[PDB]
Swiss-Prot record, chains A, B, C:
This is Cyanuric acid amidohydrolase. GO terms for biological process: atrazine catabolic process. The lineage of its organism: Bacteria, Bacillati, Bacillota, Clostridia, Moorellales. Residues 1-104 are annotated as: RU A. GO terms for molecular function: cyanuric acid amidohydrolase activity; metal ion binding.
Length: 362, 362, 362, 363
């Protein structure tokens, strides 16, 4: 029996560890039981966002000191997934996952379970291609076993951090005689997100393997996962996976549920995800621990038939706009802008939409 | 008796007059009866946004050929208020106000009424100061009379276009030995917006004159109008005013209602403005002609106690972010992102909030 | 006897026609003799830059009334070539090319001359391929004849407006069951610019015909023109070619010379272009009429072995940065940032460089 | 005992990249205990929300702490870390590492490179942009001069400073204590902190008389400026860190520093003059450059040599980003290398629209 506790912690800057330290110093968190930290950091969330790496370095430094181990050991032990971009009213914060073994009686209900797995590092020419899909799928299965979830229907959110391309890395690949999937560094984020998402879909049985090929990645939007949430960053060269679902072997006082936003203003889907996590009315919103969602600009350039400029705006990249919009929609339903919204939902929900999960107290 | 008709028209680009031309060619709009056009244009909505002037030039040129008068005569006759910034999912469009005297009977109930007034041009050193406040107040009272509205309680939205400062204008003021209200081009938009808004509050009796001074402008956030909506532009040197309310002397089949968003995620206020316009349920949402709202970053840097980076972000100006947020919130309630949202709400609703009006079919 | 006059005119805004009006009112410019207007407009010079069309509309309106013809016809009579993006210290301005016939003898030598020619309309499947390269080469040789320029070594600047692919133009090629060179409209602008530039290089003997194939277009960057300056347009279906050079049979009081910037900080090329235009010392800089250059971010992500962030910067489009740098380098040599630096330099100078022409008084 | 300053300009791959510094320490070329200052160009936006500055300092402090066997806190008390964000245009991210060795050699003939470092006390938020910051910076500049063994302020050629800014939380702290701040805006507070710090340099070096400086002059009287001050603001510190760089008759350095002042953003003549002042008389001698260090800014007039630009009107790109791109490009066009230090925002640093420019060169 394992019990998962989840702490959503406001942050003052990317390197702010004070909220986590307060929970450790008060005895609410044993640092040795932390298994994953999922952050919203306030950089631009795109290629040249160094707040993600700054936040991970700061958390790993702090935990290494608290645990008496090296930073390298902390990064091998704990998943650090930092999603940049806190546009609009979205509030920077970290969500800390704590897992402990407990001797507790079995109960009929399934309760929150979390699992973690890491892939090998990828060469730049593997991003957005079948090697990334297949390695991610293996890691997702590994993380499910870590979460003691055997039925993929009980997986409600699979959070992934994945790499991207920079000009220097594209040049390194070229020197080795290799072509990368795309030469635009911003677009490279989409291919890494999309290949990683398809790996989730493959692992969970949402899509059969014979449908996935290099040619389909970031092209066939009818191929998608309903629970994958992927996020790209300059600060890592592999994929990190957090599987979140419900398990019969869990003693948690939390559950997770989810829905899929059909488009960026689909407040009905927010309410559906809340209801799936056991929150039946506005009066029960106080049981939210966090809301986690993917947002994107639709390839059509429209929302319910209405044109917008997200794909056209050379001044502001579209994943920034999408995060602002979907965080605002969620905030207006739950009354709190301190929720997790990540942009770029290639093969995550339909084109223009994305998965949305809610972790709630029972 | 005056009859007011309002046409919300999607646009393909700032210079797109095709939707208006279709309505004119079909006889649905007599172009001599246009009194005002309120646009959302897809520039950045800040200082160097030339889509506002591009849209006005294109409309004035089109109408001048249709009316057989000069472009200069068109701009003397018709209010052209172009609000730039179509961030997030906000859809570019124009709202065309048609007004005509009619021989019609007096039916019980007040109906939509519209009035228009222009101020004199301002020197750069008059923006953000009492000269602009007092001259705007005079014009608002004049526009109320044009609308045949006696009671300020029947005024529901006062839309204003006002000037700003460029570097060249500031330097010229310096050469003339005059100090401007602020030496920052972007911040001059806030002072022009704020002084114009206080001109509205003064005219409508929302604030007594003895509380307004140069020192209060963009400083005393307890002073605000609940119906003022102001928008700044490089493309004009005066203020243009549209007063919108309801009158006993209106033969319109439309009504306007309003509320005030207490902050950027106040969906309750959107529903309240809908109800005030006679839209009592989701099934009646199709009676919306348009929704018009002001949005802004709160000076505290927070929403409901939660930090955001709108005031810190040197890459994206905060009025851009506020527009994306509040449009998304409105879009999630009414199911349509083609609504008017303008950013920067100094003395327009409380600090961090802004007025929101709904024009609806009866 | 051909005589070309060239007027570089500072502008206060995209719609500012006052400087051109002053020259027409004084009689220095007969508007019927204007053949082309090359503009630097202060929008972002990227996808959503409406200052280009705003400037053209304002000039077309003003000239339409001076010439007594419609705006549609003046746009066919005069080549309006608007390059957005005035980053760094680059000063917005327009350059007006006047072509007239004079009763004078030939100046003792070679003097400025312009020639114009047009290709056939290109089917969508032909854009960015040998059909466009070969047809442009033909039209360049015709424009040289029109300019009375026999030696291709006397051609120093070839402005080309070339087409692009749209969704319907691609859906027309697939309706005919054909394949276009690339699927998206944006990348098609690169292929159109590049094929047009190689057509110049082929027409002038800058490269050998047997080096150009479909496979080499936008691939073999060792192939390039030293004088071509190409830009894509949404309206035209063919290539509009303007050859600028020096003819033995000209009465112009101006000459043109050029060089090629090897990279973005090649001040040596700026000085060499000045010297080719007959400016031999700092004391003769006031003879410059304009400098016309292309800027480009090097695909390697490095300049003279030094990394930069242009291709990794998600906040600022790399073409904006390249224009700022190249303008500043030229300004550091000539003491004047009011020069024409444009982007989109495929096969125009080497990768990361671009042509640079100087028009000077004799 | 004899000071010998060595200066290493090291390309970086990212803000947290310590590899080039590590290569020099591992080879024995740098004794890490002799590092006195590191001046960085980091590739964030160089404006308010640039966290590459703190990321770079944290990464260097954690690396050096481990090499020296001391805590990160001790490293930051011993070594100046001045990270200037913003690497626009072709400007190449890099760090410049100042090493002060104690050598068993006489002083070299004449005057050779000398460096001194001093830290001010922390400033209360209501002191930024005001005389308290000016006077305290002036005291620190005089202390750093004596650390450098530079007697004559004419032999100071560049004074590099990192200074604080106002956050919303610091403004609220001041208000809770009954104090008002110089300006209620973080971005503008950077200008005031930069400008007051630069006037402290001017006062310490005798470039401006004390009776010309008052709170009302700061960021208003642009006729008042230092010709060697270079100041840079950020969120990660509450004091000013000062590096004085000049030439001393008590130095064994194989380097010298010279400077000029750019009158405007395209003043290549000033770049050449700074080169000549550092002993570089011809183009072939450019290979003697160790680094070029300069301040850039958008002129308040909105023009350069009578020509309008959009820097101050451009709401998409802050003007300090544009100024850095321009002045780096101008310097790179002269010296053939974009890996030079250019910092934006030059209040009371050279005239309005210009800024000091210094060259460290091998002899
Ligand atoms: Ca159970
Ligand atoms: Ca999706
Ligand atoms: Ca009635
Ligand atoms: Ca800004
Ligand atoms: Ca307000
Ligand atoms: Ca090129
Ligand atoms: Ca803060
Ligand atoms: Ca200065
Ligand atoms: Cl919905
Ligand atoms: Cl008055
Ligand atoms: Cl480019
Ligand atoms: Cl110069």
């Amino acid at each position: 029996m394992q019990k998962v506790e989840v702490f959503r912690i406001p942050t003052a800057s990317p390197d702010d560890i004070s909220g986590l330290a307060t929970l450790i110093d008060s005895g609410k968190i044993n640092p040795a039981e932390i298994v994953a930290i999922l952050g919203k950091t306030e950089g631009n969330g795109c290629v040249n966002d160094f707040t993600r790496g700054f936040a991970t370095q700061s958390l790993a430094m702090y935990l290494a000191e608290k645990l008496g181990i090296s930073r390298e050991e902390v990064v091998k032990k704990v998943a650090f997934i930092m999603s940049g971009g806190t546009e609009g009213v979205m509030t920077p914060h970290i969500t800390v996952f704590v897992r402990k073994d407990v001797a507790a009686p079995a109960a009929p209900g399934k309760r929150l379970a979390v699992g973690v797995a890491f892939t090998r590092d990828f060469l730049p020419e593997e991003l957005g291609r079948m090697e990334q899909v297949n390695e991610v799928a293996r890691a997702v299965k590994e993380a499910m076993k870590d979460a003691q979830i055997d039925d993929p229907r009980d997986v409600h959110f699979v959070q992934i951090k994945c790499p991207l391309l920079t000009a220097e890395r594209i040049e390194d690949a070229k020197r080795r005689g290799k072509d990368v999937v795309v030469n635009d560094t911003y677009k490279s984020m989409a291919y890494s997100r999309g290949a990683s998402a398809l790996g989730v879909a493959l692992a969970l049985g949402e899509i059969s393997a014979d449908k996935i090929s290099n040619e389909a990645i970031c092209h066939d939007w009818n191929l998608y996962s309903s629970v994958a949430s992927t996020s790209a960053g300059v600060e890592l060269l592999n994929d990190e996976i957090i599987v979140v679902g419900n398990s019969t072997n869990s003693a948690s006082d939390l559950v997770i549920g989810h829905s899929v936003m059909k488009d960026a203003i689909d407040a009905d889907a927010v309410r559906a995800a809340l209801k799936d996590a056991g929150i039946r009315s506005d009066d029960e919103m106080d049981r939210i621990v966090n809301v986690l969602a993917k947002a994107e600009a639709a390839s059509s350039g429209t929302v319910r038939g209405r044109r917008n400029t997200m794909l056209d705006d050379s001044d502001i990249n579209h994943t920034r706009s999408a995060r602002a919009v979907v965080n605002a929609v969620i905030a207006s339903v739950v009354g709190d802008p301190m929720v997790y919204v990540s942009g770029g939902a290639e093969h995550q929900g339909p084109d223009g939409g994305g998965p949305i999960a809610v972790i709630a107290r029972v």
